Amino acid sequence: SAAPKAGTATGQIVAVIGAVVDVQFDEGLPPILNALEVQGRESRLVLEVAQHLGESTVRTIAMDGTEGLVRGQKVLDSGAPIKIPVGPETLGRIMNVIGEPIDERGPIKTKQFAPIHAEAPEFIEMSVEQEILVTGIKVVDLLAPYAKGGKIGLFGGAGVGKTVLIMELINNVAKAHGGYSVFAGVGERTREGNDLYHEMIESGVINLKDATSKVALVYGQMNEPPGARARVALTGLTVAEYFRDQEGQDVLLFIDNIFRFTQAGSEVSALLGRIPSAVGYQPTLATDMGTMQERITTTKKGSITSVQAIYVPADDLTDPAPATTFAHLDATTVLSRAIAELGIYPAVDPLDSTSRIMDPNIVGSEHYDVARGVQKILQDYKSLQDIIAILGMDELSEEDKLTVSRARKIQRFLSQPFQVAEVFTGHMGKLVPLKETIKGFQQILAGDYDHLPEQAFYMVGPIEEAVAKADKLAEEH
Amino acid sequence: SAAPKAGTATGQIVAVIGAVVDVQFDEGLPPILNALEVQGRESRLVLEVAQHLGESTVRTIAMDGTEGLVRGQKVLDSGAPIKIPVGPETLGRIMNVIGEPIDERGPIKTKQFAPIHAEAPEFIEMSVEQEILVTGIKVVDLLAPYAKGGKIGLFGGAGVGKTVLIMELINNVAKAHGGYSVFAGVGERTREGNDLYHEMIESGVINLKDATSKVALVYGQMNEPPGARARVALTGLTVAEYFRDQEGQDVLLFIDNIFRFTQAGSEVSALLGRIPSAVGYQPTLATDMGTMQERITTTKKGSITSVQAIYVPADDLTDPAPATTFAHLDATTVLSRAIAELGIYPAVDPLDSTSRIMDPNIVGSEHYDVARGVQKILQDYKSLQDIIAILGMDELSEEDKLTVSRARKIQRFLSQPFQVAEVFTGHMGKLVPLKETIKGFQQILAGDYDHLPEQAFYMVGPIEEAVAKADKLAEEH
Amino acid sequence: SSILEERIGADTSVDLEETGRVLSIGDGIARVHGLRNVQAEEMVEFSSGLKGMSLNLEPDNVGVVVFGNDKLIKEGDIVKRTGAIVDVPVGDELLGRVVDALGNAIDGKGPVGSKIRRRVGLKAPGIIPRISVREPMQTGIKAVDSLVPIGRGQRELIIGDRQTGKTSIAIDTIINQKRFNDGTDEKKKLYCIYVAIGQKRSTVAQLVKRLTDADAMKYTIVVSATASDAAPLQYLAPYSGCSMGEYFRDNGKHALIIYDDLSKQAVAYRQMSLLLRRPPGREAYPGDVFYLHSRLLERAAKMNDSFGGGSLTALPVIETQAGDVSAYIPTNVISITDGQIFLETELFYKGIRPAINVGLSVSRVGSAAQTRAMKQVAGTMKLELAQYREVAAFAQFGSDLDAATQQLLSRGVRLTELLKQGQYSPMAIEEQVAVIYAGVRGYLDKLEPSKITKFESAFLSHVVSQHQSLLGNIRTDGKISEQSDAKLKEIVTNFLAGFEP
Ligand SMILES: Nc1ncnc2c1ncn2[C@@H]1O[C@H](COP(=O)(O)OP(=O)(O)OP(=O)(O)O)[C@@H](O)[C@H]1O
């Protein structure tokens, strides 16, 4: 309802220091998490309360520039978390980290607005039902599978996958899928955020005319302070929710980096009066990546086939950032920079890309066996490639020299370039939902078909092309 | 002029804690940077003001032992930075970190004294004119060249180069050069400081009789607190300056370690009430190595062909100490400890020894080409020496086996032992200003002359000696 | 801000509402008293006539970052209000000049009293104002343009270890705008804003003068935050030049801004905060190390016709420590910018200059930048080298393998001598189309290399001496012609036997 007591819910800013504005209320102390309203402004300055410091004073985490703020400025107490307009009347449109229309097409006329801080689905809300969902992407689909209400997560540092694969999945998914779609870009580029808009126009997905828009655009990025990159992923989540719950539909949700919910803490913790930790971080990263990620899940009212992305600071998986997150992704894909060199794209690596839906009952006995066998051969492969033979193959032991043909070709078959990379060489955006994955790949490991001039089968996956390439690049006389 | 207000410029020491003495003035608060005078003393105790803490109290960085100081001792406010006697009437003499005569020959009768804290040369004071200056030292001269008003800098940890090369350059330079010379030893040994004196006597440079002294000796070293090692390099700099400016001459300036200006901060920062940083350091190292080094430069009134030395803590170039400094040296020479093993001396390494005066217009097209080609062959050399062949040369690929003769001999040709190392084996102090560098070295890379029994050409550079050594150590029958 | 008649100021300071008397001070973080109505960033005035901006408004002080060394700022100094968030000078006037980093000129060329300022705190536009990066920007560095094409309105990070070429490249990319800054097509122009952060003020005078030699300085604005300058100057500077170009990115016109050493600003940022006692995080960097280099770059955006059609391309320069490009700050900066040209000292001397590590670098924005010209030629170039990193590092020990494979390796060595751009002169895009194009269309190839450079130098003289038409076809059609291909073919083929008996 948002209404205070019969006393001032107005607080006079007592201290501004970067992304933190301490406020002091004399007749109405406003709760942790409450979205506040800076008066004296020339725009919208909501400061989210964060602590209750005493001496009748809160401590808010500022949602936008704190520029020109003044020690004494009146802060307005609303009476509820930052609540965004949730509904159909916000699809196709673009919303910033508060519910303000950023795509410029004016007011978001809505029946109501949901709070961005809500109690997650309880334990008897959950649903074990793990129904499959094909993406038609070699490793990403066959190797480490996905699933309805599942959780995707890609792991690479700066530019190796993530945004690209999120657009890729958008292709193989976002375009064709019942129900709606959401995309909360957190932290990342404004460029991609714009193109993505326009691409979503050029392809209908976002239609400015009729009312045939299935996606919703919640944004909060880089040119902004941390208090906004912190909650943006929340709004794009407060969005997928209402579509599932109050409008029982199987939404999806694209978060261009969900751990941007953490950089926000790496920028607001210590400046809130906290004692640092892992690399500096916060005594919270856990509950954080926790409390939030424990929202984009299914329930006995609807499903959320969410999709996220997690950055890899200093190229260190050893960072409690991509790591702590692992335990949330119902599919893994740690893309190697050391792989990018090799061209192998997507850079999904043959070890650190797990899953919680890869049993012979859903993915397959044959397929999961060859997967195991792919990685098996791949493991002793990782060793042989260096250990024993020492770089240079050939040597002896055709058993592993077999690996040099099998595993090698395997890496290739899995290096699906796909549509999203069209801007570098306009190459055959290979895909196809399984279909003829049978026979082809199976052949390799057993030895069937495998033997064609190594790199002759590099930039293509489907075995059929081996002979269909042998003509392109031949050898004999 | 140095004179206070019509009120006490006397402050009573309120707190001594090691190299920091807080003082408290009641009727004359003395500015940041002001050199102060401890009364009640049995010598000279100048405490340089550093902060203005409030409660009418400064905070000075003590210039010498704080021993026996007492909470209440009167501190005298002079009215100006630590100002040393600058002039001709200080050449040949030896000055400590305040202008006190340390060579013992009594008063430094001078017309005036310059402040050690002065506004550096502005942007329209600068001069692009980069006129060459030969040192006659293989790598150090040919490879990474020098220049008038340039900036030398050597990078090695404890004992690999630096002091030695500073004496070396002193030989090839200091002795013969128009104008004057200065040597501010910072931090480093008192031994070297004494010998250097005496050597400067034995060779005339410093003449105690006539008045034929071209050098000036400003010292502030190890047996002292950090507040002195901090400014000593400044005085030896306040010295080179007045010779260039007010006495328009092309001075030089030898700083036995200029980053000793930084260890001083690593010893006084946090104890001044600062929050640590890189390895602990200071929120200043930057502006420090900055503000100061932005003094030993030329101008539209005179040039300073300065020479400095920068230590490599923990043998880590990765330390923001040798590093941050790089961007100041108009010539690089990171001497490798891993090189010392190999004997290669000076230990100037084939990659990390750059320059800002190595273009074919000043150093040469031929020479810069062979330099590039020396390092080129040297790079794939660094790889081959291990990668591919695996330690043991021979193998195959005479292309790189050529490198094993070329690059190897190259390393030797550049391993100029020179005069300064006379105390280990009295070896041929090779040098010579270019002269016959033509033909000789050029031959190697192309293949001309190269082939003589590897190490047969180790402790000598000039190719002529290859055959001139083949007799010393022969092989055949 | 004003004072009274009765001597030196008379009435002002009397009220801690609009003024404030310094409490403490040291290491340029004047903890000023009073200043009640100060805003959270309104740059203030000390008694010693010195600037500083109120950065930490607090219950019983304002904690100001002092602009420029301490000496004069002292416990009691009266502080005055300049009610205006961190703003600086801008306009066309600043063209052909060099100033510090707060506005005012330095190069003793007199005043540049501007009448159109520009705050630095501006927010990046957005999804809507920005359109698509089209209408590239020619550097003139063959290896760059053809290989790694830069688009207009985008951030292209140029990373490189000490002494690798990060500034020559940026000095050639700026120098190239020569012909256009007096040519016909006004839209085919470019104004540059060269910023320097850290650098010795003589390295900066090496550039101002050097550029001046090619008259480049005539159509460029250069600004400095050189070592002397207290850490804040070295901090406010990028955000100053950003507002320089924004005149152009908001007025049809366009700009090329070079942020020289954001990493050096990295070294120079952590300072200002630590001294403010804002809890340090990773390697000292104040937590918002992101918002430091994001907030900025996010301003060099492409402008749509409905918003201007202008632009601002920004290449942030970064210090590579031995080769690691993934260090905190570099990650921070490569996790934003689109396209990062890596410069490797490790290569350099080998002749491999500019030395760009394909695989650990990209144009990112895609084929959009590279005009039909490069999309006709360069389309193969970069990715040819991508996987090639293997065979180039494998052929050195190859034997009983794919005999003919030699081709894919041969397309590397020969091509190399042409891909290694390096000189104080840019090669116009239609010239790039002359030489490099000849390579992709395997014609030179087989010939024993080395003399290739003789081609990339002579071919040009050969062109302007007897082939002025060909290039014009680029200025007519705007691609390599079926006809012109035949002709260039008839010229490069002759060069095979041009040194072949
Ligand atoms: N095109 C080129 N080809 C070969 N060498 C070059 C070229 N351009 C410049 N050099 C030289 O190589 C070095 C690289 O330029 P520059 O010195 O500015 O590099 P940087 O990476 O910016 O580092 P820093 O300026 O701190 O030294 C210089 O000595 C420069 O003059």
Ligand SMILES: Nc1ncnc2c1ncn2[C@@H]1O[C@H](COP(=O)(O)OP(=O)(O)O)[C@@H](O)[C@H]1O
């Ligand atoms: N499908 C792909 N195929 C090949 N290379 C790719 C692909 N996607 C990205 N890359 C490479 O990665 C670089 C940037 O990584 P990208 O995936 O776009 O980063 P992110 O998605 O984290 O924003 C590209 O510019 C390109 O070299």
Ligand SMILES: Nc1ncnc2c1ncn2[C@@H]1O[C@H](COP(=O)(O)OP(=O)(O)O)[C@@H](O)[C@H]1O
């Ligand atoms: N010219 C030289 N030739 C060979 N070895 C040298 C030379 N100069 C120094 N060394 C070696 O380095 C050791 C100490 O390093 P030195 O250069 O004297 O240290 P620094 O100059 O930093 O004080 C010597 O005792 C010796 O082994």
Ligand SMILES: [Mg+2]
């Ligand atoms: Mg440079």
